[PDB]
């Protein structure tokens, strides 16, 4: 509903689609979105622009696609244009995939340009192993582990990837996975 981790440098977030643009400014509680009001079990894509103001002028830090997955209770940011403030000083066309979402958590699928992904995982309360397929990457397995509040007051899987790292958060009555292949380190999500 409210995504504060998707904002950069305490700036703005202009998501724009269908001839409408809403700017979520950080530091204000009025920013909100659909708590599953958009279609569930479907990736809804938005065009986002991250901006800050320096000495009375707005500067775009990044832009690209912004996709969400809806359930009863994962935000993904496909950057297409980011700034090289360290070397070039120019807004380059560098493409990078990230995950910056969370929802309503309880207390106790997609990848880069690959919308058709299946998340088939199971876990039993022994104290989370899962298999992920239907992707460009050949053969990825989530490694089972224990769960705890971990100071987040919510159960967290904090599993691994098979040499990897995965994180799945329980909700209801949602996750992100990092994998490293030979070609590049691919970012995968769980839903």
């Amino acid at each position, epitope marked *: 509903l409210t995504l504060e981790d998707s904002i950069r440098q305490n700036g703005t977030l202009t998501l724009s689609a269908q001839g409408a643009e809403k700017t979520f400014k950080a530091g204000d509680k009025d920013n909100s979105l659909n708590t599953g009001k958009l279609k569930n079990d479907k990736i809804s894509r938005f065009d986002f622009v991250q901006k800050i103001e320096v000495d009375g002028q707005t*500067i775009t830090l990044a832009s690209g696609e912004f996709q969400i997955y809806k359930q009863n209770h994962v935000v993904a940011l496909q950057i297409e244009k980011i*700034q090289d*403030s360290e070397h070039s000083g120019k807004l380059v066309n560098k493409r990078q995939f990230r995950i910056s979402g969370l929802g309503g958590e309880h207390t106790a699928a997609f990848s880069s340009d690959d919308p058709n992904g299946r998340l088939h995982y199971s876990i039993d309360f022994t104290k989370g192993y899962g298999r992920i397929e239907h992707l460009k990457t050949l053969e990825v397995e989530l490694a089972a582990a224990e769960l705890k509040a971990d100071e987040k007051s919510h159960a967290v899987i904090l599993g691994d990837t098979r040499k990897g790292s995965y994180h799945l958060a329980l909700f209801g009555d949602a996750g992100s996975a990092e994998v490293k292949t030979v070609n590049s380190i691919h970012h995968i999500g769980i839903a």
Partner: antibody
């Protein structure tokens, strides 16, 4: 307002070293790179190098690799430039200029220091 | 290094007419992002260079409407629609697409009166 103060002139003996300063005021100093430009007497503007007070990186012109040394002090909002083993061909005017680290602004080379007239002679 | 050439060393003009100052590059100053990184500068005698045109065509804050910017890849021109006497000075083009940033030679505006 944005003001960049440079010493009017500086005389030194040949073979010595000099550290030119360029103070800054009126803008978020860490967000802007600092470029240095030499204009010799007669004609010609040479770009020397840029220094980033945020990243600490210096990009330099190879012609001034062993001639120029760029340092910055963010607290004092001043950038420095040390010239080394000075010869007669270094008698020139040296400018500083701000350059926002971000693309898409009107804040690149839009404010220039008044210049430092460096005369090197015995 | 990119080589900026200003073929005209000086151009004469009578007050009220139009002037064109040109500048050529060794390589296209168009980046893949589509932005052409070219600046136009005016250096008045005994003064620091002053930004006139940015992004090859966009006028800079404080620059009079008389000044105009145009260009392509490897070809760029600055235009003064009606030249006044305050426009006397040397005009410098400059690339900032690649290090080292390089200036042009400079074209002096001469006023025939």
């Amino acid at each position: 307002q944005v003001q960049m103060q440079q010493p009017g002139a500086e005389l030194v003996k040949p073979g010595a070293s000099v550290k030119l300063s360029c103070k800054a005021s009126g803008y978020t100093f860490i967000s802007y790179w600092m470029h240095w430009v030499k204009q010799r007497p007669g004609r010609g503007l040479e770009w020397i190098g840029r220094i980033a007070p945020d990243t600490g990186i210096i990009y330099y012109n190879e012609k001034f690799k062993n001639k120029a040394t760029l340092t910055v002090d963010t607290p004092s909002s001043t950038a420095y430039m040390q010239l080394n083993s000075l010869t007669s061909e270094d008698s020139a005017v040296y400018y500083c200029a701000r350059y926002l680290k971000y693309d898409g602004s009107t804040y690149r080379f839009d404010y220039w220091g008044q210049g430092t007239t460096l005369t090197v002679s015995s | 290094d990119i080589v900026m050439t200003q073929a005209a060393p000086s151009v004469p003009v009578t007050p009220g007419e139009s002037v064109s100052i040109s500048c050529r590059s060794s390589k296209s100053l168009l980046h893949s992002n589509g932005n052409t990184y070219l600046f136009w500068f005016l250096q008045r005698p005994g003064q620091s260079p002053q930004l006139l045109i940015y992004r090859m065509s966009n006028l800079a804050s404080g620059v009079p409407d008389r000044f105009s910017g145009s260009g392509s890849g490897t070809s760029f021109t600055l235009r003064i629609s009606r030249v006044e006497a305050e426009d006397v000075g040397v005009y410098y083009c400059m690339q900032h697409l690649e290090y080292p940033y390089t200036f042009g030679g400079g074209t002096k505006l001469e006023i025939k009166r």
